[PDB]
Design a protein around this ligand. Structure first.
Ligand code: SF4
Lengths: 430, 552, 433
RNA sequence: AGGCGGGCAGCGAA
DNA sequence: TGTCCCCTCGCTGCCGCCGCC
């Protein structure tokens, strides 16, 4: 087929910015683009699955994945190449994940969630265009049932679109169109009562219905592709790639609470030193920055809350966004190879270079003089015998033993992790 | 004498043949060489005549240089291109001749080679050198090679930087040793005389005939002695001077706030000294780096009470130069060096091992790329070439050792007849081999999976995979699979890819038991230089294969 | 398309040949599908069998006799089995490997198909054109006759790269002959050329910059000469599998890129191999693989042997309706061969089911021009010989179409259409180059 | 804080 | 009037930019 025919067929296929993936793609693409596009969509899908397994909120999920859209598979672009990337990537993963039922379930779940997101950032005009591209009710029928439909959908609009004002809800309802469908296809909404039900028909919460239809059609197409796969088993090129891709699958703590006494009372000595140096200097150096950021990640501080806390502690935004935002997001494993970096344990902390002037990282039981450590203990109401005990532990090089002693006197005995210290201190209050 | 294209100064002429009369330039250069030779015979007052002979050498070198000066009234870019071309050719031929006699060339620089003679005495190496000289001088009518220096021990730091012990004979057959250095941090003007003296002592110790570990211990002892001397400021200030000459006016340096000589020049200009472009700025770092740099004359004034910073010197002026000096020396403990100089050992611990790798499961790796090229090209056959002149047939294996072809500087050369392959005479053969393989692939031979049938035919049934023997259940498959043909085409592509040839990732063309096994193996530096020198030929030979790899 | 060989697609096309010709024979001879049965199984009744002629042994001697042939049934007809042929009861025959045949016989014992008669495959229809089209073509010709010259490669000898005779030929066609369309076949830069094969490519003093690849050799050695061709003479190139300028080494072969050859759009066109095109009302069928030399017949009967071999080849091809019906293709032992892309034999069949008005398949045999089954067959031969002596080229002169002279036969029907009578109007002259 | 990639400037050497 | 001392390669330190562990 010619280039003009391909362009016309594609423009017909993506008259809306989203597609249902009904007709398989037509054209020739290289093995390079095949593998690259399949890997890109698999990366986005693995990220959605990792977000699911952590029970993250929907909003947090799109916040994480929007840059991955801008990087791997950009959406809402008039470029034909990106649209073909999306289409061929979806069908390549369709080919790859159809071998087993578990793979099919995972694929359809992730793809339907991706559809949910993609419909979410699409605008209301674009959403209407895609939906029009399942019978919509006429204007007279909507006007006749306007009161009941408004009563049914008012709560849903308020809770999903955040239209707290009644006038905004009424304006949205005036423009909102509805689809007449039977309750057998909308039973899940009927049970929760999100759809007005009349004479055996449910008046559509349309995203849930669209996603369910997507899941059903996708599962049927996956089964059909599994039926047709033995014919395509004859090619030497694709089989290793499909096999590789199949095996490739296989707040209480916020920016203001970490500053409070309630949370800081559960910190170890090192984290107190980092926190206090941050407060004094409004800035921390690299090893101290990474140490404190990883500890905060271990205690449950979110990426957004970490960014807010780090921005407010560094009392311009230009240099922050240029130089520290990427580091503070990458500690959380949101870019690069996306390493959810494990917080440093006491061995990792003690393996770092010894701090100098202005450097606050490390272990106070090793880097501080005995006088400063002793004074910090008197500030903790530690008696002289206890101070002598922890100093004896420090003098032998058993800094972790000294920290464990400090924990016991201030509050499985041995603690070799600041996050373990914090968790046990929180448990003692729980 | 040289016919050149005057419509494109980048086109390279060829040497005029023998019958053309000696021209103007060779005659003038011969006269100047005779004059400098007469000056040298006068040498054999000495220092003044040495100035004379080096000036005459500079005149001779300028006679070539202005063939590359744009504003020269006698600008001839093609001439300079051709002289440099021929010079590189003679260096390549000299190195290859060295390898022909089983000799180890350890370095070479634009007119010279350094040969490891493997000898424990002077005369044993001198005999080999004279034989080499006699063998090479025969190739040229007027070009002549000659022994320049003899090094008892040679330490190559990097390109253009090395130190050696020169053997200087005396009147009564007596031989003495002298330390000769070229281009190192010692010989620089940016480095203090203190650094020069301590580095001179270090090299004198290492290259001397002492136990290696004992040499390192002696050097270490010297080093902490200098550490104490520098820290206590028990050294005269004069040895702390740093020289840097500014090519531009100190106003026209954008990032001059970091480089210290600009600040020193600004202070001198404010004080009442004349500083302009080309001036040499001397200074001392006292106790940012640029803000603590002051001129000697200001520092020599005791009323200022300026004490040089032992930290900056002990790191950058001393530790780094010695660390560079002993990098390749056996059992060089950089951590111990820093400990002797009191530096942070964690900064040096990451250079020995390259620090911890660090990674998650990176699934961005297609199984196509993960397959080793050796296993890919294992089921391939070598490229066969015919010499256009002597008709000898040899397997081509890229820029690698062989008994039949040499990848000379000008191009591919045959060992039997010494003729040069023109690019067409190689691309045509490449294309012929590729098309013969393709035609064999399209011959459509079929082979049965069954071991007790194994029949090969070009007959196919309307059931393609059904064997044509009565009752045979074996799976019928193409004998020349397109996977094998893709492997062969990728092998032909690899044979002409500069990167793979430079890392020596090409499949060897001979097994160790083959009677045609190359007797002299190419050195890695030789392969890099050749693959850079024949980049056009390799890229064209690769484009010929890419003509058929794009379609496949 | 791509240099891929799929066994299953190959077998599918091989079966489809049998199926299509079975349908054609049933349609022409007004036979019901019930009359056709499996010839590989014993039957007490005479049946109709259609299949492909194949050797009785997969590893076969290079020479074949009427006692060493077999028939290949389709998947549906006989589960693809092959059965031996018993030709004792028929006296006149002409068979070759890869031929599709329509047959009448009986399998008396189970292990042999006893042959009683052969069903001759119907000759495909000839092209037709309306009165307005013929009048327009007559106006185009301005009364004068239609001139076309066909030339075939190689264009230079085996011991030099001189193309002076090409210069003389271009001078002639420009100043004296003045044709309407010129047809040139490949290979232009043959890859089996001896100096090219051995790499003995000499330095050319006649080029300012020496070429570095055979494609540049073509751009510097053929292209400026082809530019000397007059604008008023439209030219067409049909490549061969041996062209070094072609990256498609299979038959069928795609058309060369005219922009890659640097050759002007004003009068130059490049067609594929095989190809079919119209100049005025004329039909061409052009294939650049030597079927005449490669086709090796198994012949019985005095009458069949007494016939000209070229006529027999032409009838075989016209009946088979594909330009190179031999399967497997010929090989040259490896040096070259037919290089059949068996996955794409569909492109090799006659376009639209029409017998071409002029069928041109260059061959290494002696130049000839013959009329077979109202279809003219032309082979102008190689433009040069191996020794460099004068070769041959064919000039085709066709009288201007006229409805009044009666040389165009009207076809009865509601739509008035006229068959072209090429053999009545075309004079083919084979000129020494 | 560290390795890599491209850019500028200074400099020793053929 | 306004000039010059071959380019090119490799080596080291400094500075700003980008991605990463
Ligand atoms: S022992 Fe571990 S947790 Fe305690 S202060 Fe030292 S580094 Fe921190």
């Amino acid at each position: 087929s010619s280039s003009e025919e391909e362009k016309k067929l594609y423009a017909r296929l993506y008259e809306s910015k989203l597609s249902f993936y009904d007709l398989p793609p037509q054209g020739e693409i290289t093995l390079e683009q095949f593998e690259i596009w399949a890997i890109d969509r698999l990366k986005i899908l693995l990220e959605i699955e990792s977000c699911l397994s952590r029970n993250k909120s929907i909003k947090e999920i799109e916040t994480i994945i929007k840059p991955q859209f801008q990087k791997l598979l950009p959406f809402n672009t008039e470029s034909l190449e990106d649209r073909k990337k999306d289409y061929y990537s979806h069908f390549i993963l369709r080919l790859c994940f159809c071998r087993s039922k578990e793979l099919r379930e995972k694929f359809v779940r992730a793809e339907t969630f991706l559809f949910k997101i993609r419909f979410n950032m699409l605008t209301s005009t674009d959403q209407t265009k895609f939906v029009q591209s399942l019978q919509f009710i006429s204007n007279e029928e909507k006007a006749e049932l306007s009161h009941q439909l408004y009563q049914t959908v008012s709560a849903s609009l308020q809770f999903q679109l955040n239209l707290n004002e009644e006038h905004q809800r009424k304006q949205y309802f005036q423009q909102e169109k509805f689809i007449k469908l039977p309750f057998e296809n909308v039973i899940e909404l009927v049970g929760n009562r999100l759809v007005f039900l009349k004479d055996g028909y449910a008046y559509l919460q349309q995203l849930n219905l669209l996603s369910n239809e997507f899941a059903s059609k996708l599962n049927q197409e996956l089964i059909k592709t599994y039926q047709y796969l033995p014919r395509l088993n004859e090619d030497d090129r694709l089989l290793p790639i499909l096999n590789h891709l199949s095996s490739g699958y296989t707040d209480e703590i916020n920016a203001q609470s970490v500053w409070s006494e309630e949370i800081s009372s559960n910190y170890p000595l090192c984290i107190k030193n980092l926190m206090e140096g941050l407060k004094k200097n409004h800035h921390l150096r690299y090893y101290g920055r990474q140490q404190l950021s990883l500890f905060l990640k271990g205690i449950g501080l979110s990426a957004d809350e970490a960014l807010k806390f780090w921005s407010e502690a560094f009392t311009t935004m230009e240099k922050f966004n240029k130089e520290y935002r990427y580091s503070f997001r990458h500690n959380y494993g949101l870019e690069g190879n996306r390493i959810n970096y494990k917080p440093w344990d006491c061995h990792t902390i003690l393996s770092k270079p010894r701090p100098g002037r202005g450097d606050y990282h490390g272990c106070p039981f090793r880097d501080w003089s005995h006088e400063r450590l002793s004074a910090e203990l008197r500030s903790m109401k530690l008696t002289q015998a206890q101070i002598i005990s922890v100093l004896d532990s420090c003098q032998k090089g058993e800094y972790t033993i000294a920290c464990t002693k400090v924990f016991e006197m201030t509050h499985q005995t041995h603690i070799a992790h600041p996050n373990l210290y914090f968790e046990r201190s929180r448990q003692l209050q729980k | 004498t040289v016919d050149r294209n005057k419509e494109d100064i980048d086109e390279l002429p060829s040497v005029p043949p023998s019958e053309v009369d000696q021209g103007v330039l060779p005659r003038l250069l011969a006269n100047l060489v005779d004059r400098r030779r007469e000056v040298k015979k006068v040498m054999k007052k000495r220092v003044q005549c040495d100035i004379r002979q080096q000036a005459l050498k500079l005149t001779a070198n300028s006679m070539y240089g202005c063939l590359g000066y744009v504003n020269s009234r006698f600008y001839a870019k093609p001439l300079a291109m051709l002289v440099t071309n021929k010079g590189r050719e003679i260096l390549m031929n000299t190195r290859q001749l060295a390898e022909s006699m089983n000799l180890l060339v350890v370095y070479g620089d634009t007119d010279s080679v350094m040969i490891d003679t493997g000898c424990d005495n002077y005369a044993d190496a001198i005999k080999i050198g004279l034989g080499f000289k006699r063998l090479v001088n025969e190739r040229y009518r007027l070009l002549e090679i000659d022994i320049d220096n003899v090094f008892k021990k040679l330490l190559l730091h990097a390109k253009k930087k090395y130190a050696a012990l020169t053997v200087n004979l005396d009147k009564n057959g007596n031989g003495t040793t002298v330390l000769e250095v070229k281009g190192l941090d010692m010989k620089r003007r940016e480095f203090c005389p203190l650094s020069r003296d301590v580095s001179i002592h270090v090299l004198n110790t290492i290259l001397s005939d002492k136990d290696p570990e004992e040499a390192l211990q002696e050097v270490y002892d010297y080093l902490e002695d200098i550490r104490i001397k520098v820290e206590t400021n028990n050294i005269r200030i004069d040895k702390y001077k740093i020289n840097m000459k500014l090519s531009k006016d100190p106003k026209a340096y954008p990032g001059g706030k970091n480089m210290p000589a600009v600040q020193v020049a600004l202070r001198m200009r404010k004080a009442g000294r004349v500083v302009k472009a080309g001036s040499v700025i001397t200074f001392v770092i006292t106790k940012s780096v640029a803000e603590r740099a002051h001129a000697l004359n200001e520092v020599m004034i005791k009323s200022n009470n300026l004490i040089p910073d032992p930290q900056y010197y002990l790191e950058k002026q001393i530790f780094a130069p010695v660390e560079r000096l002993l990098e390749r020396i056996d059992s060089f403990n950089v951590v111990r060096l820093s400990e002797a100089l009191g530096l942070d050992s964690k900064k040096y611990f990451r250079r020995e091992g390259g620090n911890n790798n660090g990674e998650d499961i990176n699934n961005l790796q297609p199984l196509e790329t993960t397959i080793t090229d050796v296993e890919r090209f294992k089921d391939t056959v070598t490229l066969e070439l015919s010499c256009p002149s002597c008709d000898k047939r040899f397997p081509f294996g890229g820029i690698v050792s062989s008994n039949y072809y040499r990848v000379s500087y000008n191009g591919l050369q045959c060992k039997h007849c010494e003729q040069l392959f023109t690019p067409l005479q190689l691309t045509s053969q490449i294309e012929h081999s590729i098309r013969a393989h393709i035609s064999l692939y399209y011959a459509g031979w079929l082979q049965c999976d069954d071991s007790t049938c194994g029949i090969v035919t070009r007959q196919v049934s309307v059931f393609g995979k059904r064997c044509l023997n009565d009752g045979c259940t074996g799976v019928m498959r193409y004998k020349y699979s397109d996977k094998q043909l893709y492997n062969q085409l990728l092998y032909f592509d690899s044979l002409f890819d500069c990167e793979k040839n430079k890392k020596q990732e090409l499949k060897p063309i001979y097994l160790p038991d083959d009677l045609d096994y190359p007797k002299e193996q190419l050195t890695e530096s030789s392969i890099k230089a050749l693959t850079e020198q024949n980049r056009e030929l390799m890229e064209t030979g690769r484009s010929v294969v890419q003509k058929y790899l794009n379609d496949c | 398309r791509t240099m891929r060989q799929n066994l299953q697609e190959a077998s599918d096309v091989l079966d489809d040949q049998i199926e299509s010709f079975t349908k054609i024979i049933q349609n022409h001879y007004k036979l019901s599908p019930n009359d056709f049965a499996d010839p590989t199984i014993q039957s007490q009744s005479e049946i109709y069998a259609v299949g492909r002629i194949v050797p009785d042994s997969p590893t076969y001697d290079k020479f074949l006799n009427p006692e060493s042939l077999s028939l290949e049934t389709s998947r549906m007809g006989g589960v693809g089995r092959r059965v031996r042929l018993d030709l004792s009861q028929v006296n006149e025959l002409s068979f070759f490997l890869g031929q599709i045949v329509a047959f009448k016989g009986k399998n008396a014992n189970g292990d042999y198909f006893t042959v009683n008669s052969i069903l001759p495959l119907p000759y495909p229809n000839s092209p037709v054109s309306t009165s307005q089209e013929l009048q327009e073509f007559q106006a185009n010709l301005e009364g004068s006759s239609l001139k076309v010259i066909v030339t075939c490669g190689p264009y230079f000898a085996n011991d030099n790269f001189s193309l002076e005779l090409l210069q003389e030929f271009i001078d002639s066609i420009n100043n004296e002959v003045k044709p309407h369309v010129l047809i040139m076949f490949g290979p232009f830069i043959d890859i089996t050329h001896p100096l090219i094969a051995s790499g003995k490519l000499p330095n050319f003093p006649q080029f300012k910059t020496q070429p570095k690849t055979l494609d540049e050799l073509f751009l510097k050695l053929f292209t400026p000469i082809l530019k000397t061709i007059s604008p008023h003479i439209q030219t067409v190139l049909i490549p061969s599998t041996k062209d070094a300028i072609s990256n498609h080494a299979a038959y069928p072969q795609a058309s060369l890129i005219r922009k890659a050859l640097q050759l002007p759009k004003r009068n130059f066109k490049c067609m594929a191999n095989p190809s079919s095109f119209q100049i005025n009302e004329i039909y061409f069928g052009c294939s650049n693989v030597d079927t005449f030399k490669d086709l090796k017949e198994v012949i019985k009967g005095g009458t069949t042997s007494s016939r000209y071999r070229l006529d027999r080849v032409s009838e075989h091809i016209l009946q088979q309706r594909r330009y190179y019906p031999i399967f497997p293709g010929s090989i040259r032992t490896h040096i070259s061969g037919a290089d059949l892309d068996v996955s794409y034999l569909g492109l090799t069949e006659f376009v639209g089911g029409f017998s071409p008005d002029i069928m041109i398949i260059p061959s290494e045999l002696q130049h000839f021009a013959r009329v077979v089954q109202n279809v003219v067959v032309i082979n102008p031969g190689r433009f040069i010989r191996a020794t460099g002596n004068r070769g041959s080229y064919a000039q085709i002169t066709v009288q201007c179409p006229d409805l009044e002279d009666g040389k165009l036969t009207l076809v009865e029907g509601e739509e008035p259409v006229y068959l072209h009578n090429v053999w009545k109007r075309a004079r083919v002259d084979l000129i020494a180059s």
